[PDB]
Each structure stands twice: as structure tokens, then as C-alpha cells.
């Protein structure tokens, strides 16, 4: 079960409990692949004993960090280290003292899902896109069952590997992805994650359009309050859009659970015609 590392009196102690310390000499930084909240994100490789090198992403904590930043940065590792599922990004380990501070994660060659789909706009069949959504739902089902509420589920936080497997990422600690009760009353639960999941479905079926396009945050909020919901994207079957609508139920208890979502998508894969009903 998920342990919130901020329940520890010393959060540094949780890092060492859940994340393997790595020798910096075994980490090769090859290229800068992104900017993070805390420092550059790089691709490279990690040398493991007896094994061929594994390709990794390396999140750096930029030099000159405070203790608070180090703590906040490493919290991601102390959370990610607790998980083991095919659709959740795997933690290789961390470098926390004595050498440049880093979190080392499995390399996802194709990067963030929203950018990936924008690049490959119109190149995936409904069944392929549904397969991606099913992977994300299976990752979320696992997390919800572990007692973990994500809060920032969005296509930009889903990573895609060279085999097109989609995995949940971003375990550190927005409006248009967030359930109304979470925006207004800070009630974040797995049911508000299901609302976010609905938005992710729409992002996927639209090949990475911005939810609600150019509407302002305030206009999104008001629209949702009046019963507005985003339409089926081009080529999106009606049944799949109905599942989005179900994720966006005003009353959180009426939204499907992730287990139900997985089942529904599996049925659309086995019987693709049923995606229209």
C-alpha cells in the first residue's frame, strides 16, 4: 500500500527506504531532452551489474538547490519507488548525496503523449488509440488500488516508449483537467482522477488538442457548471465519447471506477463495432 513520504518526520529517510542509491559513475548523461521544475531532464544510460546497459531518463536537481528543493524533488522518487506496474514509469534509482543529485527513470523514447499524438496526428486507428487509453487506465487502476491519488493526470504526464506503451508519470507534488469538486473544495480523490482521465481520453482521441481550446479557466469553470461537456473529436465513436461523459459526471460517485473503465475499453477492443453503441 502507498505510504505518503510526508508522514515521515524526516522525508529524506523515505527516499532511502524506497529508492535505490546509484553510483554516479554508472550513469552516462547523453543529451538534454527537456526542462523540469527543478533542472534539466536528460537521456542516457545506466550500468547494472551483469546486465546490458539500460536506457534511462535522468532528472537533475540543478546545482544551488536549497534543502527544501532537494526534499521536494526527491519526494517523487520516494513515491515512484513504491510502485511496480507495466503502465507506471519505473524508477531505477537516485543519487542523493556526494554527487550531482538525480532521479533515474526508465527511458520513454517517444516522450509525452500529447506531443507524440500531435506529431502523429491521424496516424493511429481507433483500436490503437483505445489500446493506449486502456494502458493508462490499467496504470491508474493499479495506483488507485494502492491508495494513490495522482492529482495531475493529463496527457502531458503520460509517457510513451518505443513499443508505444503508455505509462503514468509525474509523481511530484491544471484547471481544465481537474474535477469541479477538486477545483472548488480541494477534494482530490481517485474519483477526481477519473474526471482527469476523461480529459486524457479526449486529448488522445483529438491527437493532442488543448481541452476547451482557447477558453479561459474561468469560462471553462462556468461552462462545466452549466452542463457543457467537450464533444466527440473527429472519428471518435459515440460509445467512447459516452465513456468520457461518464467520467465527467457532476456527482463524483456516479463516475466509473478505473476497474470499470478497463473493462469497458477491453470490450471495445474485443468488439470494435461496440465502440459506436
Q: Which residues are catalytic?
A: 152
Instruction: Please state, in angstroms and rounded to a whole number, the distance separating the CA atoms of residues 31 and 231.
Output: 40
Q: What is the CA radius of gyration of the chain?
A: 19
User: Residue 121: how many CA atoms within 13 Å on its side-chain side?
Assistant: 10
Torsion of CA 199, 140, 129, 230, to 10 degrees: -10
Length of the chain: 277
Q: Are 193 and 144 in contact (CB under 8 A)?
A: yes
Q: For the purposes of burial, counting CB atoms within 10 Å of the CB of 214, is it exposed (0-12), middle (13-18) or buried (19 or more)?
A: exposed
Which residues are known binding-site members for ATP? 33-41, 59
**Residue 185, C-alpha cell as written in the block:** 473544495
**Residue 132, C-alpha cell as written in the block:** 493506449
Look at the block and give the residue holding cell 482527469. Answer: 196
The interaxial angle of helices 11-18 and 67-80, nearest 10 deg, is 40
Instruction: Please state, in angstroms and rounded to a whole number, the distance separating the CA atoms of residues 196 and 174.
Output: 10
Taken in order 261, 163, 52, 23, the sign of the CA dihedral is negative
Amino acid at each position: 500500500t502507498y505510504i505518503d513520504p510526508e508522514t515521515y518526520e524526516d522525508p529524506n529517510r523515505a527516499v532511502h527506504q524506497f529508492a535505490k542509491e546509484l553510483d554516479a559513475s554508472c550513469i552516462k548523461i547523453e543529451r538534454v531532452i527537456g526542462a523540469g521544475e527543478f533542472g534539466e531532464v536528460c537521456s542516457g544510460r545506466l550500468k547494472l551489474p551483469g546486465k546490458r546497459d539500460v536506457a534511462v531518463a535522468i532528472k537533475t536537481l540543478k546545482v544551488g538547490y536549497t534543502e527544501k528543493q532537494r526534499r521536494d524533488f526527491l519526494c517523487e522518487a520516494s513515491i515512484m519507488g513504491q510502485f511496480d506496474h507495466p503502465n507506471v514509469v519505473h524508477l531505477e534509482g537516485v543519487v542523493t548525496r556526494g554527487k550531482p543529485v538525480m532521479i533515474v527513470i526508465e527511458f520513454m523514447e517517444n516522450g509525452a503523449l500529447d506531443a507524440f499524438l500531435r506529431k502523429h496526428d491521424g496516424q493511429f486507428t481507433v483500436i490503437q488509440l483505445v489500446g493506449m487509453l486502456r494502458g493508462i487506465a490499467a496504470g491508474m487502476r493499479y495506483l488507485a488500488d494502492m491508495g494513490y491519488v495522482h492529482r495531475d493526470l493529463a496527457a502531458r504526464n503520460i509517457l510513451v516508449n518505443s513499443n508505444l506503451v503508455c505509462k503514468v508519470s509525474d509523481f511530484g507534488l491544471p484547471v481544465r483537467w481537474t474535477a469541479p469538486e477538486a477545483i472548488q473544495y480541494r477534494k482530490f480523490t481517485s474519483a477526481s482522477d477519473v474526471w482527469s482521465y476523461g480529459i486524457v481520453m479526449w486529448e488522445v482521441m483529438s491527437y493532442g488538442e488543448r481541452p476547451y481550446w482557447d477558453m479561459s479557466n474561468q469560462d471553462v469553470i462556468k461552462a462545466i457548471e452549466e452542463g457543457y461537456r467537450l464533444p466527440a473529436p473527429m472519428d471518435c465513436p459515440a460509445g467512447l465519447h459516452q465513456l468520457m461523459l461518464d467520467c465527467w459526471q457532476k456527482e463524483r460517485a456516479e463516475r466509473p471506477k478505473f476497474e470499470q473503465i478497463v473493462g469497458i475499453l477491453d470490450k471495445m477492443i474485443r468488439n470494435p463495432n461496440s465502440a459506436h453503441h
